Design a protein around this ligand. Structure first.
Ligand SMILES: Nc1ncnc2c1ncn2[C@@H]1O[C@H](COP(=O)(O)OP(=O)(O)OP(=O)(O)O)[C@@H](O)[C@H]1O
Ligand SMILES: Nc1ncnc2c1ncn2[C@@H]1O[C@H](COP(=O)(O)OP(=O)(O)O)[C@@H](O)[C@H]1O
Ligand SMILES: Nc1ncnc2c1ncn2[C@@H]1O[C@H](COP(=O)(O)OP(=O)(O)O)[C@@H](O)[C@H]1O
Ligand SMILES: Nc1ncnc2c1ncn2[C@@H]1O[C@H](COP(=O)(O)OP(=O)(O)O)[C@@H](O)[C@H]1O
Ligand SMILES: [Mg+2]
Ligand SMILES: [Mg+2]
Ligand SMILES: [Mg+2]
Ligand SMILES: [Mg+2]
Lengths: 366, 371, 369, 370
C-alpha cells in the first residue's frame, strides 16, 4: 500500500492510498522549550512535533521547517517525517512505497536531498514526487488546465493541457495564507488588540478562518461597515476575553486581489490567472476559460468564487463563458488526486526504485 | 544514607527524614538569652536556649529571631539552631547524611553561598542542595501545573509553573506575612485597652491571632453587624488569669492581607498579586493557571480565606473563566512534604552537590546547580 | 505662533516652534496622597502634576496616565495637558494651534479622542498629529534612512525613503526604558537592596541612567566582572546609604539586545532593525544601511553605538558599509524635528481647522492624517 | 472665644485660645484627709484639688486621677474639671466651647466618656479632641518633622511630613517622668535616705527637677564620680535636714537611654526615634533627621539635647546631618499649639456641635476627631 504524503508549509496531509481523506492532518511545526525546567518528573521532551506542540504552544517557540514551499530546516523536516510515519501513520517506511508532492519549480538539489534522505534514513522501497497542482486537477476529473493552488506558503496557477503541464506558462505569487495571517495581526492593533508571539499567530489564524470573508464589492462593503454595526462579530479568546472586529473581516482576504495592502508590487490572483491563460495557445484559451479550478485552503473564504467570477469576466472578451470550479473538498484536493493516481494500476509502473537511486545517480528521480 | 530535609523558615523550623509524611521536629526559630541577674548559684543555668526550651522559659529571656523576611540575619544564632536541630532534635550525625535545604525566591546570592559554606566546613555534610519553597509546594500537591500562593511568617510569594517549566519573569514576592499581622493586631488591641509590648508578649498575641481571627466575605457588612450587636465577640484567657474580649479585631487583622494599606503599604493585596501574576504569563496558559490555585502556608489557615480569595479573583477574572482555589487541610507543611518527595526520587539523587565539587570550585557552585 | 507638545510615556516635552530646545521638560506623573492629613493650617491639593509630584514623592502614589504609548487615564491626561499649557507654558490653548505626536501602529481611537478633547476642552483653533519617527529624521537633516526610536514607552523602527514612511516595514517592540528599570529593580535584590514602591522606582531609574552602560562583548565582560572588582561603583541613596553594583551595570542594558532576559520571545534591537531593512525594496537597502539614525532616551547608554555597529555588521552583507548615526542631542530629536516642521510654511496647509472638525466629527483626523 | 485644656498625667494646663501661656497651671491631684478631725468646728472640706492639696499634703493622701495618659478615676477627673472651669478660670462652660487633648494610642472609651461628660455635665456648645504631638508641631512653626513628646505618663514619637501624618510609624513608650521619680526614690535608699509616703514622693520629684542632668559619656562621668567629689551637690529637706547625692544625679535621667535600669525590655529614646524614622519612606528621612522637635517637661534635663544628638549621629550614616530642636518653652508646647489651632479660622468648621451629639450620641468623636 502506497503512502500519499502531501507535506505543505502549514499542514501535513498523510494517509493510505485508495481512501478519500487524509488520516493525519496536523500542523507542520517543531517547538522547543524556551523556559527553565524545575520539576524532575518526566523527561520533558526537548522537541514537540505536530499537535503536541500546538497543545503546549504557551511554553514553546514554534518553528516551520518549510518556508514558502521550500524546505529550510532539514533536521526539522526529518523529525516531522519521522513523526508522521511512526506516531501518526504507525507504519514502517520500509514496507510502503510512499508518494510525495513537492511544489512546482523545485530546485534539483532540493529534490535529490529529499530522495536521498527518504531512501537512506527511512529505507523506503520506492517513491515518486508529483506536482501539487496537477493532482488537484486529477481529483476534479479534468485535463483542462489553469489550476489555482493557494495554500499557506505559495500561490500557483499551473496550466495542464491533456495531462501535460505547460512549464513556461506557470505563474507564481508569493502571497498566501501566512501573509494574510500577518496582515490581520498588523491591522488588529487598530482596535487595541495586540498579538506578537508565535502562539498568538495561531490564535489570529483561527480568527481569520472563522470570521473573515470575501466581499464582491469592496467600496460598498466599506461604506456599509462604517455606517452600521451589523457586520461586526464576536470571538472569545482562549483566556476568556471577548474581542469584536468590524471591517477587518472583509479587509484581510482582500489582500489576495490587491497585494498592495502588504506592500507587494505584483498582480492579484485574478490578474495572474488572466496573464497565465493568455500565455498559452489560442485554442487552449477557450478551454481554460470554461474550466477553471480553485484549490487549496486559502481559497475557502465565502463568496470567493463569485468575486473571482466577476473579476475574470472583467478581463474577458465578453463573449466566452467564464466558469470557476470550487469543489467542497478543495482543502484536500491535492491529496485526493494523489490518492487516485496511486490507486491507478497503470501508474504502478512509474516508481523510482532503490537500486536506480544507488546503482545510478541520485538524480534518477528527475 | 538517608537524605535529611531541613525546612528552616522565619517562624517554625521543620526538619526530618525524606520519605516520611510529617516532620519529625517542629520548633520555633528563636534564641533566648538571660536579661536578669542570677542569684542562685549552681542551678545548672544554661547560657542560651533555643527551640521550645526558650519558649517555656520566655519570661526571663529576650526571644530573638535569626531569620527576618526570609533572609538570614544572624549567622551565629543560625548555626546554634542548626546544631540543635541536628544533634538534639534529630539526634543524627550530619557527617553521614546529605541535607536538602530550602530558600525563598528573590533572595541575596550571599544567602545560599553562606549556607553552602556553613554546611560543608562546619557540619561536614557529604552533599547538599537548595530548593524553592513554592516548587516544593507543587510537588506535594501531585501536579506539575498551577500558581502557588505560599504565605508564611516572613514572606509571601507566587510562582507560576506550567508543565514543569517555571516562569521566572512572573514571580511576585511580597513582604507581608504573619509577623506583620501579629504586629498589626498589637496596635488595634491597644484600642480596647490591652497593652502587650515585649518579645514574650508577642508570642501571647500570636496565640490569640491563631485561635480567634478569621476572614469575612464582606468587610463593610461585617462592620455593620459588629457595631449593631455583640454577637461577634469571643473571650480569651491570658497566661496569668486575666480575661480579654475582642470584637471586630477578629476579622480586621487578617484583612491586612487583602488591604495592605492598613499597615501603610503601597502594594496590592494577595488577590491582586495572584491575578497580576497570572496575566503576566502567556495567554495560552492562563486558563490552566486559573483552575489550579494552590495555597500552602501557615498564614493561609484562616477560616474563610479560600472563599474570600475565590470571590476577589472571580470579579477580576472574566465571567467565562472558572476559578478554583485548592486548599488542602494539611497545607501548613506542604513545603516540607514536597521536599520529602523530591529527595526520595531517584532522579534527584544524581543532582546533589557533592563535597568534591565544592572543594575544587568554592561555594560559588550553588548558583550554577541549584535553582 | 504654533505649539509643539511631544507627549511621551515618561516625559513631556512642550514648547514653541522655531526653538532649538524644549521649554518644559517634566515627568508625566499625577500623584495623589495616600496618608491622612492632620495640619489644618496648610494648603493640601488633591493631586500633583509634573515636578511637584517628584518633590513630594514620599507621601504620594505616582501614576503614569500613558503606558506603552497608549493613553489609559484620560482624566489624568486632561490634567497633564492643562498643567502644561497654563502652569508650565502660561499661554492660552485657544490662541496657538497645537502639534501633537502619536507612536506608529497605535489604536485608531487614540487620535479620535485626542482631537475631540483638544477641540472641545481646550478649543484650539487648529491641530495636527504627526508620527514621532518621521520627526526624528527631520532633526538629523536628511530624507532617507531608518530610525530607531526608543524611549520610556515603545521601541519602533520606521524606514523612511525620500520622506516616504513605508507602512509595510514598520516594526514595533514594547521593550524600552521602563522595562529596563523594572529589570534592574528585580536583579538588584541579588545584593540585598530591595526597592518596591513607586517612589523607590524613581530612585532606581536614576541609578540606571548614571551607572548602567553597554559592553561590546557580554561574555568576556562577565568573566572580567567575576574575576576582579574593577567594575564595581558606588551610589549614595537619598537616605545617605551606600550601594554597590559590579555586574548589574552592563546586565540591565543587555535586555535590549536579548529580550529573553525578561521572558520576551521578540528579537533584539539589532535584529529588528535588520528585519525592517530587508522588508524594504532591494534598490534602497544600501541607503538605509548608511543612514541609521538613533533617537530617544533609551539609546543614551555608553557604547551602544559601537555595539550596534558590530551587531548589524555581522548580520549585514560584508560588502555593505554600516554607519550608525547617534547625535549627542538624540534625546530631544522628536521635538526638534517637530519644531522645524511647524515652522515651515509648506506645512501650514495641513492643519485641521475648527470648522473642518465641526462638519466631519472626530473621524476627520484619519482622512487629514 | 474657646477654651484650651491640656489635662495631663501630672499637670493641668488650661486657659483661653489666642494667649501665649496657660492662665492656670496646677498639679492634677486630689487629696482626702486620712487622720481624725479633733476640731470639727472648722470648715475641713472633704476633698482638696490642686495647689490646695499640695499645700496641705502633710495630713493628706495624694491620688492621681490620670495614669499613663489614661484616665483611671472618673469621679476625681470630673472634680478636677469642675475646679478648673469654676475656680481657676471662673468662666461659664455653658457658653464657651472647649478643646481637649489626648495621647496618640489610647482606648476609644477615653474620648467617648470625655465627650459625654462635657455635653451633659457641663453643657458645652462644642468640643474637639486633638493629638498632643500634632499640637507640638503647631507651636514650633513647622509642618514637617518627628516630635519626641515626653512627659509625666507617656513618651511618644509621631512623624509628620508636609502636613501628612504616618500612623504606622507612631511609636509609644510608657516610660516618663513618673517612672524616673520612682527610680530616684529607690536608689536614694542606697545612701540611707528613705522616702515612702506620697508626700515624700513630691519631695523626691522636686529633688529630681533641681539636681539631675544627663551625662554625655556614662562610663567616663562614672569614673570621675568615684575619683573625686566634684559632682557632690547638697539639698535641704523641708523639715530642715540636708542630704548629699553624687552619682545619682546623672543616673536617674540615664534610665531614658538605658531602660534596663528599671527592668524594662523597650529601647531607649534615641533608638526609638531612629526606629520611627527608618519606618518612614526613604525620600522623607532626610527631612525627618533635620527636624527633631523635643517637647515636654521630661525633656528639660540639662544635656539631653546634646546626648540625643550624639546618640542619633552614631546610628545615622555619616552623610546625614542630625539637628535636635529644643526651644526653651518646650514645657508648654502642647498648650501653645492648641491655642493657635483653636484661633485658626479654618478650624471653626470642624467643632463637634451639640446637635451632632444629640443625633449620634457619644460616638461621633471618632468620625470627626482624628
Ligand atoms: N476555512 C478556511 N478559511 C480560510 N483560511 C483557511 C481555512 N482553512 C484553512 N485556512 C488556511 O489555509 C492554510 C492551509 O491550507 P493548505 O492545507 O492548502 O496548506 P498547505 O498544504 O500547508 O500549503 P502549501 O502546499 O501551499 O504550502 C493555512 O494558512 C490556514 O490558516
Ligand atoms: N491557625 C492559624 N491561623 C492563623 N495563622 C496561623 C495559624 N497557624 C499558624 N499561623 C501563622 O503562621 C505563621 C508561620 O507558619 P509557618 O508557615 O509554619 O512558618 P514558616 O512560614 O516559617 O514555615 C505564624 O507566624 C502564625 O502566626
Ligand atoms: N543618560 C541616560 N542613560 C540611560 N537612559 C536614559 C538616560 N537619560 C534618559 N534615559 C531614559 O530615557 C527614557 C525617557 O526618554 P524620552 O524619550 O525623553 O521620554 P519619552 O520616551 O517619554 O519620550 C527614560 O525612561 C530614561 O530611563
Ligand atoms: N527642670 C526639670 N528637670 C527635670 N524634670 C522636669 C523639669 N521640669 C519638669 N520636669 C518634669 O516634667 C514632668 C511633667 O511635665 P509636663 O509635660 O509639663 O506634664 P504632663 O506630663 O502632665 O504634660 C514632671 O514629672 C517633672 O518631673
Ligand atoms: Mg499543499
Ligand atoms: Mg515556609
Ligand atoms: Mg518620545
Ligand atoms: Mg504633656
Amino acid at each position: 500500500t502506497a503512502l500519499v504524503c502531501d507535506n505543505g508549509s502549514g499542514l501535513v496531509k498523510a494517509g493510505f492510498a485508495g481512501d478519500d481523506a487524509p488520516r493525519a492532518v496536523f500542523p507542520s511545526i517543531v517547538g522547543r522549550p524556551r523556559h527553565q525546567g524545575v520539576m524532575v518528573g518526566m523527561g520533558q521532551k526537548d522537541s514537540y512535533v505536530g499537535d503536541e506542540a500546538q497543545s503546549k504552544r504557551g511554553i514553546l517557540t514554534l518553528k516551520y521547517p518549510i518556508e514558502h514551499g521550500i524546505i529550510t530546516n532539514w533536521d526539522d523536516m526529518e523529525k516531522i517525517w519521522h513523526h508522521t510515519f511512526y506516531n501518526e501513520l504507525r507504519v514502517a517506511p520500509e514496507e510502503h512505497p510512499t508518494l510525495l508532492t513537492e511544489a512546482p519549480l523545485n530546485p534539483k538539489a532540493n529534490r535529490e536531498k529529499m530522495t536521498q534522505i527518504m531512501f537512506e534514513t527511512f529505507n523506503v522501497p520506492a517513491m515518486y514526487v508529483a506536482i501539487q497542482a496537477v493532482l488537484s486537477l486529477y481529483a476534479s476529473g479534468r485535463t483542462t488546465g489553469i489550476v489555482l493552488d493557494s495554500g499557506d506558503g505559495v500561490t500557483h496557477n499551473v496550466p495542464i493541457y491533456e495531462g501535460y503541464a505547460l512549464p513556461h506558462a506557470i505563474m507564481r505569487l508569493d502571497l498566501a495564507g501566512r501573509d494574510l495571517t500577518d496582515y490581520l495581526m498588523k491591522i488588529l492593533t487598530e482596535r487595541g488588540y495586540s498579538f506578537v508571539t508565535t502562539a498568538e499567530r495561531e490564535i489570529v489564524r483561527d480568527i481569520k478562518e472563522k470570521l473573515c470573508y470575501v466581499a464582491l464589492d469592496f467600496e460598498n462593503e466599506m461604506a456599509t461597515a462604517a455606517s452600521s454595526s451589523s457586520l461586526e462579530k464576536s470571538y472569545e479568546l482562549p483566556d476568556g476575553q471577548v474581542i469584536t472586529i468590524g471591517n477587518e473581516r472583509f479587509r484581510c482576504p482582500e489582500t489576495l486581489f490587491q497585494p498592495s495592502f502588504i506592500g507587494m508590487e505584483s498582480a492579484g490572483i485574478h490578474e495572474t490567472t488572466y496573464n497565465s491563460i493568455m500565455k498559452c495557445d489560442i485554442d487552449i484559451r477557450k478551454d481554460l476559460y470554461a474550466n477553471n479550478v480553485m484549490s487549496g485552503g486559502t481559497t475557502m473564504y465565502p463568496g470567493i468564487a463569485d468575486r473571482m467570477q466577476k473579476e475574470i469576466t472583467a478581463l474577458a472578451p465578453s463573449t466566452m463563458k467564464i466558469k470557476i470550479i470550487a469543489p467542497p473538498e478543495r482543502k484536500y484536493s491535492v491529496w485526493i488526486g494523489g490518492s487516485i493516481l496511486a490507486s491507478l494500476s497503470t501508474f504502478q509502473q512509474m516508481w523510482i526504485t532503490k537500486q536506480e537511486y544507488d546503482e545510478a545517480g541520485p538524480s534518477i528521480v528527475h
